């Protein structure tokens, strides 16, 4: 769910998830998967493919239970969809922290439409 998603990203990334990634680039942010501008983008480009392989659950509404155990996010959901969705989010929260050095803030809010085309998930 996005209530979870953000918690990990603020945890893993240390930033406020709406101002840093709410709308950064072609993929991250709002409706649309454009073609990745940089890496703190394609972290999102993939998070969106991740999400589209799930079936017994809503990527944006269902809530699950994850943990911040000894500075790490850990999922324990057993629900084969809530769990495999936790992981999905867990990985972007990391990738997003991971490529925080190439992060560029010119893209903070990019004109979505003016963006390349997406590849196929």
Short mmCIF file of C-alpha atoms in Angstrom, two decimals:
data_model
loop_
_atom_site.label_atom_id
_atom_site.label_comp_id
_atom_site.label_asym_id
_atom_site.label_seq_id
_atom_site.Cartn_x
_atom_site.Cartn_y
_atom_site.Cartn_z
CA UNK A 1 0.00 0.00 0.00
CA UNK A 2 1.30 3.49 -0.36
CA UNK A 3 0.99 3.96 3.44
CA UNK A 4 3.67 1.23 3.71
CA UNK A 5 5.65 2.07 0.66
CA UNK A 6 6.42 5.57 1.92
CA UNK A 7 7.42 4.35 5.41
CA UNK A 8 10.16 2.13 3.97
CA UNK A 9 11.30 4.85 1.54
CA UNK A 10 11.45 7.40 4.28
CA UNK A 11 13.21 4.81 6.39
CA UNK A 12 15.60 3.41 3.77
CA UNK A 13 16.05 6.64 1.83
CA UNK A 14 15.94 9.15 4.69
CA UNK A 15 13.96 11.59 2.53
CA UNK A 16 10.26 12.59 2.45
CA UNK A 17 8.75 10.35 -0.16
CA UNK A 18 6.50 12.88 -1.72
CA UNK A 19 8.93 15.70 -2.36
CA UNK A 20 11.81 13.58 -3.49
CA UNK A 21 10.16 10.83 -5.52
CA UNK A 22 6.51 11.80 -5.78
CA UNK A 23 7.31 13.09 -9.22
CA UNK A 24 10.85 12.55 -10.26
CA UNK A 25 11.39 11.62 -13.87
CA UNK A 26 9.69 9.50 -16.45
CA UNK A 27 8.63 6.56 -14.30
CA UNK A 28 8.48 7.53 -10.58
CA UNK A 29 5.48 9.39 -9.30
CA UNK A 30 2.08 9.59 -11.00
CA UNK A 31 0.27 7.53 -13.59
CA UNK A 32 2.70 6.52 -16.32
CA UNK A 33 5.77 4.49 -17.03
CA UNK A 34 7.96 6.47 -19.36
CA UNK A 35 11.50 5.56 -20.23
CA UNK A 36 13.97 5.95 -17.38
CA UNK A 37 15.75 9.24 -17.26
CA UNK A 38 18.39 8.11 -14.81
CA UNK A 39 18.71 5.39 -12.15
CA UNK A 40 16.65 6.97 -9.35
CA UNK A 41 14.01 6.45 -11.97
CA UNK A 42 14.50 3.07 -13.40
CA UNK A 43 14.30 2.09 -9.76
CA UNK A 44 10.73 3.15 -10.25
CA UNK A 45 10.48 1.89 -13.80
CA UNK A 46 11.00 -1.66 -12.48
CA UNK A 47 8.91 -1.17 -9.25
CA UNK A 48 6.04 -0.63 -11.63
CA UNK A 49 6.65 -3.90 -13.48
CA UNK A 50 6.98 -5.61 -10.19
CA UNK A 51 3.58 -4.38 -9.23
CA UNK A 52 1.95 -5.52 -12.48
CA UNK A 53 2.72 -9.22 -11.98
CA UNK A 54 0.72 -9.45 -8.76
CA UNK A 55 -2.89 -10.81 -8.74
CA UNK A 56 -4.50 -11.71 -5.47
CA UNK A 57 -4.07 -8.09 -4.24
CA UNK A 58 -4.08 -4.33 -4.81
CA UNK A 59 -0.63 -2.83 -5.07
CA UNK A 60 -1.87 0.48 -3.83
CA UNK A 61 -4.52 -0.35 -1.24
CA UNK A 62 -3.83 -3.53 0.67
CA UNK A 63 -1.87 -3.10 3.86
CA UNK A 64 0.66 -5.55 5.15
CA UNK A 65 3.10 -5.90 7.99
CA UNK A 66 6.77 -5.38 7.51
CA UNK A 67 9.57 -4.69 9.93
CA UNK A 68 12.44 -2.47 10.60
CA UNK A 69 14.57 -5.01 12.37
CA UNK A 70 18.15 -3.94 13.07
CA UNK A 71 18.25 -1.31 10.37
CA UNK A 72 16.60 -3.58 7.73
CA UNK A 73 13.13 -3.88 6.23
CA UNK A 74 11.85 -7.42 6.61
CA UNK A 75 8.65 -8.83 5.29
CA UNK A 76 6.59 -11.43 7.09
CA UNK A 77 3.23 -11.60 5.34
CA UNK A 78 2.70 -15.23 4.30
CA UNK A 79 -0.08 -13.91 2.03
CA UNK A 80 1.49 -14.91 -1.27
CA UNK A 81 0.45 -11.56 -2.67
CA UNK A 82 0.81 -9.23 0.23
CA UNK A 83 4.23 -10.80 0.80
CA UNK A 84 5.34 -10.74 -2.78
CA UNK A 85 4.14 -7.09 -2.89
CA UNK A 86 6.18 -6.19 0.17
CA UNK A 87 9.26 -7.43 -1.48
CA UNK A 88 8.44 -5.42 -4.61
CA UNK A 89 8.34 -2.24 -2.49
CA UNK A 90 11.24 -3.36 -0.35
CA UNK A 91 13.46 -3.55 -3.36
CA UNK A 92 12.64 -0.02 -4.69
CA UNK A 93 13.02 1.53 -1.28
CA UNK A 94 16.54 0.07 -1.38
CA UNK A 95 17.34 0.83 -5.06
CA UNK A 96 16.07 4.31 -4.41
CA UNK A 97 18.41 4.60 -1.47
CA UNK A 98 21.05 2.79 -3.39
CA UNK A 99 21.20 5.24 -6.27
CA UNK A 100 20.86 8.27 -4.10
CA UNK A 101 24.20 9.53 -5.29
CA UNK A 102 23.30 9.85 -8.97
CA UNK A 103 19.99 11.36 -7.79
CA UNK A 104 19.52 14.57 -9.65
CA UNK A 105 17.01 17.10 -8.52
CA UNK A 106 16.44 18.87 -11.79
CA UNK A 107 13.81 16.21 -12.36
CA UNK A 108 12.05 16.69 -9.05
CA UNK A 109 8.85 17.44 -11.10
CA UNK A 110 9.22 16.63 -14.78
CA UNK A 111 6.73 17.35 -17.56
CA UNK A 112 5.56 13.84 -17.73
CA UNK A 113 4.29 13.92 -21.29
CA UNK A 114 7.58 15.21 -22.51
CA UNK A 115 9.33 11.89 -21.76
CA UNK A 116 10.54 8.92 -23.91
CA UNK A 117 8.43 5.78 -24.46
CA UNK A 118 8.38 2.85 -22.02
CA UNK A 119 9.80 -0.56 -22.72
CA UNK A 120 7.75 -3.63 -22.18
CA UNK A 121 7.61 -5.05 -18.71
#
